[PDB]
């Protein structure tokens, strides 16, 4: 019940007590582990609020104080009256920072307390949502010197008036299925690229077409909006060794911004809460570029490197993979856009783990996601045992809006 | 209940029913997942149900469930248990048992091969010298001049736990490790403690970088004894790189036979604490873990130096770059010398097919994603994209404490 996690490269043992505050369920049982599975009322509300406010007030060293008790009563009064309640700006910022802190799949959490929270709860329309998003995009990009940020639209009321950003990321490339049977652009977005067109988008059918924003306010039908190109910073991908690499016509966007997730704070649900940080190199080079169901460019690059692709045992796929990722990091660094390599990031995460064990008694972490999709065992986190569990406040997944939207 | 796993690269969805037959525990709960934790004497009371459950499986597999042969055997085992407090497995049951424990090894990527396992019955063994003889025959059969064959040798089961057979080596063939006075390590750092024991037990160490450890064998609860595996039985491969001619000059070699000797085989409640088994290597075992782990030979630096890599910033990915070449050299060398080896693409791809087959014919395939995914180039192998369920079936291979911590020394 007081658990220990061992790093097998350094012999460091940390003790975990934080897990004994976990409330939500993992998907696992004593008989079966689901660690690699991607997704395993008024009375409901107040204990949730209470748990949150207790944490908040303990974090500011006024646990059980006047203000604490006062606030507890105040919220309690509001819930009974209004069937919900509103967070104070202080609570909102704290909630959001702690949702990031608790996100067991994010490797970048050492930065957690340096989050810029944009309070967009006064927003009422999609145009409004568009304005708030552009401001977020411009602020976070910061001419290439990325700053972490989140923008928080109004909380769910009766699930009929939900704010949603339909895009999965604020900035993604389009996906077109060809008569050819092949697929142009990003295949992860083929369906989303479709719905953009069904609602009205004038697709230019290219390889790297920046998708439009598709914003839903107050439960209404969603609306399309083109992000000003001058706000979308992009990096052309070249290789500091292969002059031919540029001829591949590869580029990527600099701002990684998750927009499809649900932020839960003290029982309240924020269904539109786009957040952004900066890329770990492998996210683009390994996953976006090399996944079979994505841009899948390994064959092209290997062909261009003139490798023996006759045999898996030549490790040509591995060879190309490295070069590509060298290029990605190179291109971002040369255009002065923030990016972190998988070595630096994981190293920082181990440090963050030590801090969290020390100042908080633990750090929930999902090894399957923290370990980079290349060179796993030459990063420190490979040899680091982790305990995975769900704390609140949290970022949760939520259904794609098209499957739910009452048109 | 039915459970679904999804491959996100192919959208193939599989349904697991097999997990219902799982009794042992995972270490996880509804509130915590211990999926990355490496490591989260038995009365007649608990033994016969275990025996029944095993024999029931056995008889089902041979399509004789409920037969007279089946019922008579259950009867025989029950009577033998209460009379003698234990029981003996038939040769057929032992073979079936050993294969199925490999089959259920959720951390093993090579299980497509599970049904082709040479089982050597060493239950008539009584002494360490007898253990050495058996182990030699294993090494020679499995090696087969480089055309490797999977094999397991099974020494007598545990009785009261005071008479255990144990192989003290973690692997039948491994290299010595020596801590120097200056704090550096010569040879394999993972074998420092074990090398020290051997030296203490009387081993005369050449003190080199690749000294094949002697065998330290414990029979019937007695103190362990040292034996040197005949060198001519130890197949080794010099590591060279197909383009880099300076690579040979690193002075690297490895052995061809990968053989786990410190695990415990459970079959029908019986405990076989000495059960060394061998397969063949997936390249990354040597190339990535053996050579490049910081706590192992750790050759990434010297290799990268000689590659003239920009080692000044980690964002040059010099480490990743060296890692690949080293793994290229390992596979190259083994194939050149015609010793069996498999690359991680080939091996993971076969495992996906094996897994799909197991769901269709068996209703499941327990699998530990944290272990199954190779330690380099994870997402360009198909297992990375494969959802897996992990649970514990018997028969099984289990960890057991190192015998130097538990042994009661005679003297
Ligand atoms: C600032 C530098 C950051 C870095 C280097 C970073 C890194 C990562 C990486 C590599 C992933 C894996 C994504 C994938 O493979 O799909 C991830 C996921 C995640 N990150 Fe971050 N992140 C950063 C900032 C943030 C911020 C600002 C937030 C929220 C405030 C956040 C919350 C999350 C969450 C909730 C996930 C899980 C996403 C999912 O489950 O699909 N991260 N992060
Ligand atoms: C024939 C080719 C085989 C291949 C390519 C293979 C592959 C692997 C690999 C890569 C591992 C991970 C080892 C590590 O990273 O520490 C492993 C683990 C394991 N294998 Fe195999 N294996 C083979 C044969 C066998 C055989 C014959 C058996 C048993 C009869 C077996 C049983 C196991 C077990 C029990 C583990 C877990 C080891 C542990 O937890 O330390 N494998 N296998
Ligand atoms: Cl459950 C499940 C099943 C299929 C696909 C999936 C997508 C996971 C994508 N995760 C978001 C990736 C992403 C993209 C841009 N930026 C970030 N990002 C930014 C800061 N932190 C993370 N993260 C989930
Ligand atoms: Cl639980 C835990 C914690 C720290 C170290 C540890 C040792 C893992 C060793 N795994 C076996 C490695 C190995 C070596 C040679 N051969 C094989 N092998 C042969 C057939 N299948 C696997 N496997 C366990
Ligand atoms: C099946 C498996 O759970 C799936 O492929 C996971 C593996 N680990 C991951 N890790 C990260 N960081 N991102 C991912 O999308 C995934 N996908
Ligand atoms: C802490 C972590 O679980 C540990 O380092 C695991 C990770 N995955 C592994 N996978 C394999 N094949 N072998 C290992 O030793 C490990 N080590
Ligand atoms: Zn689990």
UniProtKB/Swiss-Prot annotation, chain A:
GO terms for cellular component: azurophil granule; calyx of Held; caveola; cell periphery; cytoplasm; cytoskeleton; cytosol; dendrite. GO terms for molecular function: ATPase binding; cadmium ion binding; calcium-dependent protein binding; calmodulin binding; enzyme binding; flavin adenine dinucleotide binding; FMN binding; heme binding. The keyword Heme applies. Belongs to the NOS family. The PDZ domain participates in protein-protein interaction, and is responsible for targeting nNos to synaptic membranes. Mediates interaction with VAC14. It is found in: Cell membrane, Sarcolemma; Cell projection, Dendritic spine. Ubiquitinated; mediated by STUB1/CHIP in the presence of Hsp70 and Hsp40 (in vitro). Isoform N-NOS-1 is expressed in brain and colorectum. Found in the Auerbach's plexus of the enteric nervous system. Isoform PNNOS is expressed in the penis, urethra, prostate, and skeletal muscle, and coexists with the cerebellar nnos in the pelvic plexus, bladder and liver, and is detectable in the cerebellum. It comes from Rattus norvegicus (Rat). (6R)-L-erythro-5,6,7,8-tetrahydrobiopterin binds at residues 36, 368-369, 382. The chain holds residues 299 to 716 of 1429 of the full protein. GO terms for biological process: arginine catabolic process; behavioral response to cocaine; calcium ion transport; cellular response to epinephrine stimulus; cellular response to growth factor stimulus; cellular response to mechanical stimulus; establishment of localization in cell; establishment of protein localization. This is Nitric oxide synthase 1. Heme b binds at residues 106, 397.
